[PDB]
Amino acid sequence: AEVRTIKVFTTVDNINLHTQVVDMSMTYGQQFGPTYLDGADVTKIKPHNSHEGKTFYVLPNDDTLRVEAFEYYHTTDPSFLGRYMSALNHTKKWKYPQVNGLTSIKWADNNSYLATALLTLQQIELKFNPPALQDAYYRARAGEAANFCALILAYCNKTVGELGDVRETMSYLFQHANLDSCKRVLNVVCKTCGQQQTTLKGVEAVMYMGTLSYEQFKKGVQIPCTCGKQATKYLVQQESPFVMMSAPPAQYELKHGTFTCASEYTGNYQCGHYKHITSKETLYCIDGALLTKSSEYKGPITDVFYKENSYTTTIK
Ligand SMILES: Cc1ccc(N)cc1C(=O)N[C@H](C)c1cccc2ccccc12
Ligand SMILES: [Zn+2]
Ligand SMILES: [Zn+2]
Ligand SMILES: [Zn+2]
């Protein structure tokens, strides 16, 4: 027969585009392997007449594409582009209204934890290492958070509709973020074992679970040791742009100006709903696209984010 063709660009990072010309009789998958058009798995679709001139994502099918894929994503998972494109299929259809000067997400596909995670990220000082994450991190702040949410799902190994934790989401996100000007020096005192200090760097430096009160963490908290005496572990040195305090959900009161932002969890284990409290001239309860404000807050808090720059204790 006769061969018809159109001109289309393929890419893995949407920065370096490689030009291709494809037979319109054969499907995309035969010519490139799996192929996507803005999240549409067009692997089994023959090229159309309107497709000419557009840009499609392909898998890293040669080392030039593999290197470009790493330099933008810092991942070598062959599934990453497919998982990212599957997430982008749903996130591009979500709505991202500007609530209280922050880019929130209107509820859909069980994105409650992603919304309060998105709002939290807009208030803490964080540098993402993958250029895909930073670029999309940037574009979320401007109001276009479709790719950022899709990459968050991709990097956290979560899928659309699947339920997840904000505390476990931020942990994954902190792995893929530059936290090296970050150091926590814990010191533990036991009546029998004696005294020993630890130096935590990276994710463990900014995260702790057991109590929401960062002031209480400064006084000291109770932990066991090799014998069974509840020892006192207290913060000594903290150098990080922020700290995340966590604890299983319980009634907790928040005050005007004493914190940065919080995570509200209501309901059963896993089957609950997330809401975001942020500390402003007053307290704001951002629930997806919904917004209510109050001067006091006592409710089911599980994560509290505090601003820090550098801290050294006065406890001898
Ligand atoms: C939404 C979700 C998805 C996956 C996983 N693994 C957990 C959760 C989740 O609900 N976590 C919350 C915050 C939670 C944490 C710690 C103790 C809790 C006890 C009771 C109820 C909730 C508790
Ligand atoms: Zn190679
Ligand atoms: Zn959906
Ligand atoms: Zn001991």
Residue numbers in the entry: 0 to 315
Quote the study on this structure.
As a positive strand RNA virus, SARS-CoV-2 encodes two functional proteases, i.e., the papain-like protease (PLpro) and the 3-chymotrypsin-like cysteine protease (Mpro or 3CLpro). SARS-CoV PLpro is a cysteine protease with multiple major functions, including processing of the viral polyprotein chain for viral protein maturation, dysregulating host inflammation responses through deubiquitylation, and impairing the host type I interferon antiviral immune responses by removing interferon stimulated gene 15 (ISG15) modifications. SARS-CoV-2 PLpro has two domains, i.e., the N-terminal UBL domain and the C-terminal USP domain. SARS-CoV-2 PLpro is capable of reversing the ISGylation and polyubiquitination (to a much lesser extent) of cellular substrates.
